[PDB]
Ligand binder design. Structure first.
Ligand SMILES: CCn1c2ccc(OC3CCCCC3)cc2c2cc(C(=O)NCc3ccc(S(=O)(=O)CC)cc3)ccc21
Length: 259
């Protein structure tokens, strides 16, 4: 590419992101005073473990559905082969959601927007995965310290998704080229906005892997405790991405095909 082409890529990525925001940033900020009461927190803590897992997996799956749309609108992604589209989304969809979630995190009081209000990590105690929860809160806290603009989130999440090192890619060089173009776009935009200082403060790629690994591991524990709950009440797309062996569901293929 060249300079105007790189700047065009920047604009295209930012537009794809804006169109596939689940929630506009301003909607999340306007809600920060709306905080769960102590009685409401208690109510969440008294929910059964399987009911809380089901609700959280539903919310995560809704978020992932917007990430799938983001990928479908992202320059170059639909030009990859379908094997590689699926490899990239299966490895990266959760990672993208985890980065996007920092927009819903309020570092002032350490709360996150959940089911219409802001609550702290004690809200999630019924899940019984306190280590995973605190890791996600800590990750969101780290990212909130950088004060990402929406444009920076768009360009950074594009690179989280377009990762040429994912095992299983059949056209690795094509993904490498797309990743390099997106890296240029991201770094060009940071240079233009005098924001290259954040490069050194971004999380290592092993950090996002660690969160996704913890999630899959806590899911395997839960699925052993409540196998029928997962079969009967978890979202099909969630099971295709995360459970074993749940990829007998072929939702992603359908999502990628239908316009
Ligand atoms: C870290 C605490 N936390 C969670 C902790 C665990 C958990 O699920 C566990 C592991 C995975 C599934 C089964 C059990 C699930 C959540 C969880 C879900 C939400 C949520 O969706 N809020 C609504 C919303 C809507 C849009 C945006 S957005 O910024 O516009 C785009 C992203 C953000 C937020 C918020 C916090 C959460």
């Amino acid at each position: 590419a060249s300079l105007t082409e790189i700047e065009h890529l920047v604009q295209s990525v930012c537009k794809s992101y804006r169109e596939t925001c689940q929630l506009r940033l301003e909607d999340l900020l306007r809600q920060r005073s709306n905080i769960f009461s102590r009685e409401e927190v208690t109510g969440y803590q008294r929910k059964s473990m399987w009911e809380m897992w089901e609700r959280c997996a539903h919310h995560l799956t809704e978020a992932i559905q917007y990430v799938v749309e983001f990928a479908k609108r992202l320059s170059g992604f639909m030009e990859l082969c379908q094997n590689d589209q699926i490899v990239l989304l299966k490895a990266g969809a959760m990672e993208v959601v985890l980065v996007r979630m920092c927009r819903a995190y309020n570092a002032d009081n350490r709360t996150v927007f959940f089911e219409g209000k802001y609550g702290g990590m004690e809200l999630f105690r019924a899940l019984g995965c306190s280590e995973l929860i605190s890791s996600i809160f800590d990750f969101s806290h780290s990212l909130s310290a950088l004060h990402f603009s929406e444009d920076e989130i768009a360009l950074y999440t594009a690179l989280v998704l377009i990762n040429a090192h994912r095992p299983g890619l059949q056209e690795k060089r094509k993904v490498e080229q797309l990743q390099y173009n997106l890296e240029l776009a991201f770094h060009h935009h940071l240079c233009k906005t005098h924001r290259q200082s954040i490069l050194a403060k971004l999380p290592p790629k092993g950090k996002l892997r660690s969160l996704c690994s913890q999630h899959v591991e806590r899911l395997q524990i839960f699925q052993h405790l409540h196998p029928i709950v997962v079969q009967a009440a978890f979202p099909p797309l969630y099971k295709e991405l995360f459970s074993g062996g749940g990829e007998k569901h072929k939702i992603l293929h359908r999502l990628l095909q239908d316009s």
